């Protein structure tokens, strides 16, 4: 029953998992979420 | 794979149980902690 | 700012003396990012 | 400890070699990657 933004981020993640089918699910998933944060951090740091 | 489906089901269960205010931060914290838990076993 | 964040990190390493340096350091920096994200948002 | 001093010296060397625009993001990425590298060795 999640909010729309949460469903969108979960759908993007599920799409990435199905496209890559990582041999190390946890490492791929941690790298993915740490990169999504990194992307939003660039907006937050900007002048 | 079955291990991937299990880890994805565990994550989806955590998201539905917590319904985080910051989805990205909760998800990064979750996966970093799952790695930390497996590191203890692997060392 | 970089020297101050490096000094804070070195101080944390010397105060905690972790048995797992890499895990402590990754947790530390991931938490510093988490803290800054809240303030920036 | 010797292993901790070596990892701290490697990190300080990386900071001086890259001089990152975003110190915190570079440092988090660095330690997360050092863990990733050790995970591959531990799983082998």
Curated annotation (Swiss-Prot), chain A:
Q: Which gene encodes it?
A: BCY1
Any further remark recorded for this protein: Present with 4280 molecules/cell in log phase SD medium.
> Which compartments is it annotated to reside in?
Cytoplasm; Nucleus
> What does the UniProt record say this protein does?
Regulatory subunit of the cyclic AMP-dependent protein kinase (PKA), an effector of the Ras/cAMP pathway. Inhibits PKA activity in the absence of cAMP. cAMP activates PKA and promotes growth and proliferation in response to good nutrient conditions. Together with ZDS1, provides a negative feedback control on the cell wall integrity-signaling pathway by acting as a negative regulator of MAP kinase SLT2/MPK1.
Which family is annotated?
A: Belongs to the cAMP-dependent kinase regulatory chain family.
Q: What is known of its domains?
A: The inhibitor sequence (IS) is a substrate recognition motif that docks to the active site cleft of the catalytic subunit rendering the holoenzyme inactive.
Q: Which residues carry this modification: Phosphoserine?
A: 1, 6
This protein's assembly is summarised as: The inactive holoenzyme of cAMP-dependent protein kinase is a tetramer, composed of 2 regulatory subunits (R, encoded by BCY1) and two catalytic subunits (C, encoded by the 3 partially redundant TPK1, TPK2, and TPK3 genes). Activation by cAMP causes dissociation of the holoenzyme, producing 2 active catalytic monomers C and a regulatory dimer R(2).
Name this protein carries in UniProt: cAMP-dependent protein kinase regulatory subunit
Q: Which intervals of the chain are annotated as region Dimerization/docking domain (D/D)?
A: 5-42
Q: How is it modified after translation?
A: Phosphorylated by YAK1 in response to glucose starvation. The phosphorylation sites can be clustered in several groups, all localized in the N-terminal part.
């Amino acid at each position: 029953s999640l909010p729309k933004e949460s469903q969108a981020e979960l759908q993007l993640f599920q799409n990435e998992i199905n496209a890559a089918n990582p041999s190390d699910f946890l490492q791929f998933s941690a790298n993915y979420f740490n990169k999504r944060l990194e992307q939003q951090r660039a907006f937050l740091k900007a002048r």
